[PDB]
Structure 1
């Protein structure tokens, strides 16, 4: 809260580090854009039947 707030430099580097990550996981292929939203995801379209 201390004013004026001062951010640490390393943070940006950690951010870039996270955003550049591309891995395989339970949600399928995991990759991010510059803003941090998910990219190249696969959403299985499913229907409920009798069985």
Structure 2
């Protein structure tokens, strides 16, 4: 949100078994976010 990217094109109804499967591109930007975020938890330094 600090980067102000749009998180979701559509709120509901996506189908998993679609042939051929349509990967939503924004998902990638989620993957990156989760990967790039670092925080202090119960484990120690949390970094991926």
Shorter-chain TM band: 0.5 to 0.7
RMSD (Å) for aligned C-alpha atoms: 0.5
Matching residue of 2:24: 8
How many residues are aligned here? Answer: 32
Segments of 5+ residues of structure 1 without an aligned counterpart are 33-51
Q: Structure 1 segments of 4 or more deviating over 6 A? A: none
Deviations 1:27-51 (A, max 9, x none): 010000xxxxxxxxxxxxxxxxxxx
Segments of 5+ residues of structure 2 without an aligned counterpart are 1-16
Query: TM-score of the superposition, structure 2-length normalised?
Result: 0.64
Residues 1:23 and 2:39 are matched in the alignment: yes
Query: TM-score of the superposition, structure 1-length normalised?
Result: 0.61
How far 1:11 moved relative to its partner? 0.3
Higher strand proportion: 1
